[PDB]
Symmetry: C3
Subunit: 358 residues, 3 copies
């Protein structure tokens, strides 16, 4: 069993954090999904809407097929920071599964709060990783009740909310995090609070009744959860001077997995201090979560990484070390790098640092 | 290190869901039990008691030896559905450990509740897997206090129940799910509620004092928990027109594991719609749980599966595909099937579907 | 990828439980730490202070370097049993990270409580492993507020304690168990209670203000947690007739891990009943926890174990069996022992029992 993969990063220079990213992998092992074949495509686009205010138009299109059933999700959302801790979003979208579909619109705010930050930590740790915190969501959402399936589900939830007392917001968590999603919460050192429902009402919309709910929850992390530890970094609106996009797809069945990713986006490199830059620290959640599925078959690694620096730049530090260099082009394969690839595919979070400069 | 295994399924035809199942495995790796050697035999029998009412007499006999200590458990229980959601049980049994034994009798009800089921899901998903829900237990149990060990433990629990307040039903969970059982709860996306004790009293039985307790708990699942997702299917009383039975045993120590299973029971095949039948979907809990121990030693797979269909039937779909066919007899070995066997032994839940018809 | 390791145990005879322990390992795989290189040294010393009262002076010195930042911790503590269930400690120490340091002093009590112990278990199980219980901590600690970082953090916590209500003692847990420590709690069948703060005040110390807090928590275990299951055994004060010490260090980076351990301490052997002695049962937590990192790279085992018995003693039982014997010296390598080493490095808890006698 051989895992074949290839990765490529092409960096912009100057004050830019942008890079082009490409990833390909193929491995002839069964996927762990208990319905196969399963295929999926995703595209995400972000464009500056109002750069003066810092408003970003963010879209996502997801299409999948699971055991022959076609699913889609489309969301269009306007996102902006109000403060360094508070972010707001306004959007709309739709979903479909087979012959069924429904739409939605929403307004929400998210507030990120770090627990007990200190100057003594900040000035002594040059590259901090684990930052603990809690993140509060406040959501208003509206869904037209425009078929009888929607009406039935609306009524079912009204009954539970009215009658279930404290149980409703507690027990909803095993409904929400379906299948193996529930176990993955603790695996990443994450916590999900009970849900609080502030109001749930039917409003008279233009084309009929609309189910309107305002609700809240928080989630917390011990530092592995990048959504909290890296709140600001994960939304690089200041560097979005042009549209960014990423596209990915996979095909899987009982005899293999194939995946492609292609993107162009800011945030791929970061200032590392003292004139040096680094490839951004690897986010941890993806490694930890994928780690829950990456140990089911033995494999050997056939993997190359190519990094193309801006003209005139040079790698100052890399561990594992690159295998070859041709001017600004650097390549990793085999040896220590292959062992690192095996490690992260199985859930390991060992650091691979790349530092570069002029 | 080679894992040798063999599985065989022989199906009944017509409207029958019955099959004979045989499994053998031998692998020369240490078991994970921190006391070795450990051996165990189990037999389960079910026979129709009152088919008109749908009452089943269910017995279980377990015998084990752990670090030279002999344990037994015998239970005889009458089980029936009252409704599609509520099931009742009345039974008695005994247990022994070394020189100690005690008996018990009980009456209980279990109510299964799915969370928010919908017509839009039902009509669009041809083979649903994850179904979230919660399952309520109501138990009355009676144990004769007929030696001083029983009396001592009774008193210890009375103290905790009386004095412990809300702590008792909370903290009992780490007592109940001894050793690695506690960690396995979250692993399967399962939740166990605190216990509620309604009453605990000494009654005057025929041959002396009897400790009588009525207590309740619920457990919930995000869909991996088959006890909830597949509540009806897991008790195929309608197909029990004759006695069913299964027998299994293992021997384990620090240099190997050997296991045998032999059974004859309904529910091995299921209607898949449109004239097709399938081997029942693989239950998930066993894979997930065994997965917690299946990754401690590298192994290669030496494994065959034989499925014998009823005369005149043919496989319509199988993935991974069978290696050979001789009329109604189909065999799997090597290649993609061997990779699938490795996958599920390590905790993977990738679908292996077998569809057959006339 | 080959893991090279060597272990050695040299036992004292007579009524002594003492042994010398040596361990070496080197493996060329990346460590999982998301900051590398990381190096660490630890020394622990225990000496009898007041043998008549059973007071032990316990010190620990830890020095580490993480991504070039130097950290230290020094603690000196006087420990004694008050009863078989209650232990007290009084100590002081300091820590430093880069340019920052702070000191502390504390007094604490810990009470271990087993859940529902029974005579029927005790007399029938010759070597019990899983013992469920809960362990209560009561801590008074004092920290001089002698720089502005300390003052700032003090104020931050005062705000949370005053304003946070029940949330403070709940949410502190994901702060406390930073990074992957949080996930490891459930993995070992462990539970940590919310913290209760009894008082938090500034006192006027000799050299300025001192932050004084009294707080409580408990932790519980289903039996894997050795701190609870083996409470008495883990503090063998009765056998400490001379100083004991252990020293360990590791070096790790993205291309390997190297580790050394050297110690001399009581508790290495134990009475097994009927004139036999055993090497102490393997503690489980270390195996379970290390197990969370031991599955990220395939490896083969190159490992030897040497046990040197007291003169005239002989091994009565060992499984896996030793490979060779030269009078009192016994050696394990390859075969079943190598498979056992692989097993425990990956998180397995299979028993390796060694029994010896005259
Ligand atoms: C994932 C970890 C956390 C979490 C972390 C965050 C973070 C972090 C943010 C939000 C924000 C939002 N969250 Mg939240 N959120 C969680 C769970 C939820 C749930 C739920 C029922 O589970 C809901 C209803 C919401 C609701 C919301 C909205 C109020 C808001 C915008 C969502 C959106 O546009 O999605 C549409 C997007 C998708 C459907 C797909 C997103 C897929 C992943 C996450 C994209 C990763 C980036 C990818 C690697 C790079 C893209 C580059 C492109 C070139 C641009 N969150 C979980 C528990 N949430 C954002 C906001 O603006 O708040 C005001 C925000 O900043
Ligand atoms: C509503 C969602 C949130 C949000 C949540 C997150 C989270 C959470 C993370 C990021 C991360 C990143 N985000 Mg952000 N992000 C948002 C908006 C943006 C915008 C923008 C201006 O709108 C931009 C340009 C970015 C850019 C970036 C990068 C700095 C970084 C990914 C680096 C990389 O190499 O990716 C290269 C990409 C790949 C190698 C793989 C891409 C795979 C596919 C195509 C996308 C991810 C799918 C995901 C795994 C599954 C989604 C399931 C949902 C149910 C749909 N985000 C909004 C506000 N973003 C990650 C990071 O490292 O942060 C420090 C991270 O963990
Ligand atoms: C199993 C493989 C590992 C993995 C293995 C590696 C390896 C090996 C390397 C990197 C490298 C990098 N990875 Mg990584 N990486 C993973 C997941 C992520 C995610 C993420 C949101 O999931 C992000 C933001 C990143 C980010 C990054 C950058 C820090 C860095 C440069 C980009 C690159 O080479 O990408 C390469 C692109 C990929 C590996 C593709 C990952 C696609 C993931 C699995 C998501 C697929 C989503 C799917 C198409 C749609 C899901 C839809 C839902 C089902 C609804 N990785 C997965 C979990 N990554 C490189 C590096 O460190 O350079 C210094 C490097 O050498
Ligand atoms: C296992 C997952 C759930 C669970 C799921 C279920 C399900 C599902 C059912 C019950 C039912 C019962 N449960 Mg419950 N139950 C759990 C934990 C408990 C605990 C406890 C202290 O942990 C108790 C006291 C009970 C108590 C009870 C009784 C009230 C009742 C009958 C039990 C019995 O006869 O057992 C005697 C049986 C055994 C000792 C061994 C059973 C071994 C396994 C489970 C058998 C699997 C089937 C095997 C693969 C195929 C057999 C084929 C044969 C040919 C017949 N449950 C856990 C949390 N429970 C049943 C009932 O009738 O309720 C009214 C029922 O339908
Ligand atoms: C009190 C227990 C509950 C109960 C709980 C469960 C649970 C829970 C499950 C089943 C499952 C099944 N049960 Mg039921 N089941 C009960 C009563 C019955 C009766 C009956 C008429 O009395 C019958 C005929 C069945 C029949 C069946 C099958 C439809 C199915 C197993 C298929 C298979 O291939 O097994 C072939 C068997 C094997 C390959 C392995 C057999 C191994 C040993 C011999 C038995 C299991 C031991 C178990 C792992 C450990 C027990 C530990 C306890 C502490 C004692 N059950 C009662 C009401 N049953 C499973 C399923 O798939 O459901 C959809 C499942 O997960
Ligand atoms: C580690 C191995 C995996 C496993 C690997 C496989 C493989 C490989 C195949 C199946 C197949 C099947 N398995 Mg499976 N299966 C497991 C456990 C289960 C359990 C269960 C209750 O534990 C059930 C109901 C099933 C059910 C089924 C059917 C869906 C299907 C046809 C029967 C068969 O071939 O059985 C074969 C019988 C076994 C594998 C024996 C399993 C015995 C388990 C581990 C329980 C032993 C209990 C022990 C003796 C007593 C415990 C006592 C307590 C300690 C008190 N499996 C374990 C966890 N299973 C086949 C299939 O998909 O056909 C289409 C197939 O090819
Ligand atoms: C680790 C599992 C449990 C736990 C289990 C125990 C046990 C068991 C005991 C204590 C005891 C104490 N605990 Mg506690 N304790 C935990 C978490 C905590 C936390 C915290 C913020 O997390 C705090 C503040 C405390 C506080 C305290 C003190 C009141 C007291 C003495 C500590 C000390 O001297 O440490 C200084 C020591 C260190 C900094 C390093 C210790 C490293 C490991 C644990 C040493 C293992 C032994 C090694 C293998 C063999 C050494 C041989 C040498 C030759 C001597 N515990 C966790 C949850 N705690 C002890 C006591 O005397 O109570 C009155 C005691 O007996
Ligand atoms: C405050 C801490 C507690 C305490 C908590 C524990 C815990 C918890 C455990 C022990 C264990 C043991 N302890 Mg004690 N122990 C204390 C005081 C003592 C004293 C004493 C007279 O002061 C002595 C002589 C001992 C002796 C012993 C042995 C009986 C046994 C280890 C056997 C072995 O082979 O180790 C040989 C050692 C090695 C092979 C590895 C040594 C590695 C390094 C050098 C030390 C451990 C570091 C640890 C992994 C990480 C610490 C992280 C902290 C954040 C600093 N402890 C105090 C009271 N002790 C263990 C056991 O098996 O108990 C049954 C165990 O799990
Ligand atoms: C990954 C390897 C496994 C492991 C694999 C083995 C193997 C294999 C054998 C033993 C054996 C034994 N082990 Mg062990 N053992 C582990 C951890 C422990 C710990 C502990 C507190 O962590 C203890 C008390 C013990 C105790 C014991 C005795 C029961 C027994 C005889 C001593 C010996 O040979 O030591 C050998 C010494 C070691 C294996 C070194 C372990 C060092 C651990 C990993 C801690 C390092 C701490 C580090 C230096 C500092 C951390 C600082 C913090 C980051 C702040 N092991 C780790 C997790 N152990 C032998 C036995 O069973 O004889 C009958 C045997 O053959």
């Amino acid at each position: 069993t051989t895992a074949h993969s290839d990765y490529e990063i092409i960096l912009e220079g100057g004050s830019s954090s942008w890079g082009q990213v490409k990833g390909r992998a193929k491995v002839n092992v069964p996927a762990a999904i208990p319905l196969l074949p399963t295929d999926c495509n995703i595209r995400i686009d972000a464009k500056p809407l109002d750069a003066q205010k810092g408003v970003v138009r963010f879209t996502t299109k997801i299409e999948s097929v699971v055991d022959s059933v076609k699913n889609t999700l489309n969301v269009e959302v306007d996102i902006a920071n109000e403060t360094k801790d508070r972010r707001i979003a306004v959007g709309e979208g739709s979903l479909s599964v087979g012959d069924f579909s429904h739409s939605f619109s929403f307004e929400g705010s998210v507030v990120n709060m770090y627990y007990y930050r200190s100057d003594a930590v900040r000035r002594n740790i040059p590259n901090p990783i684990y930052m603990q915190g809690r993140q509060f969501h406040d959501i208003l959402m509206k869904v037209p009740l425009d078929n009888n399936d929607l009406v039935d589900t609306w009524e079912g939830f009204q009954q539970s909310i009215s009658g279930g007392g404290a149980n409703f917001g507690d027990w909803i968590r095993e409904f929400w995090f379906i299948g193996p999603a529930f176990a993955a919460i603790n695996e990443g050192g994450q916590r999900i609070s009970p849900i609080v429902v502030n109001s749930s009402n039917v409003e008279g919309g233009e084309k009929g009744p609309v189910g309107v709910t305002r609700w809240k929850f928080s989630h917390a992390g011990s530092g592995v959860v990048d959504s909290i530890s890296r709140w600001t970094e994960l939304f690089p609106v200041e560097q979005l001077n042009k549209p960014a996009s990423i596209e990915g797809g996979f095909r899987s069945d009982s005899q293999g997995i194939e995946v492609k990713v292609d993107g162009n986006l800011p945030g791929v490199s970061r200032d590392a201090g003292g004139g040096l830059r680094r490839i951004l620290n690897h986010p941890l959640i993806p490694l930890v979560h994928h780690g829950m599925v990456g140990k089911f078959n033995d494999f050997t690694v056939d993997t190359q990484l190519k990094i193309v620096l801006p003209k005139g730049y040079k790698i100052r530090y890399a561990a594992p070390q690159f295998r070859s260099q041709n001017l600004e082009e650097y390549r990793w394969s085999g040896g220590a790098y292959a062992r690192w690839v095996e490690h992260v595919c199985k859930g390991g979070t060992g650091q691979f640092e790349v530092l570069y400069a002029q």
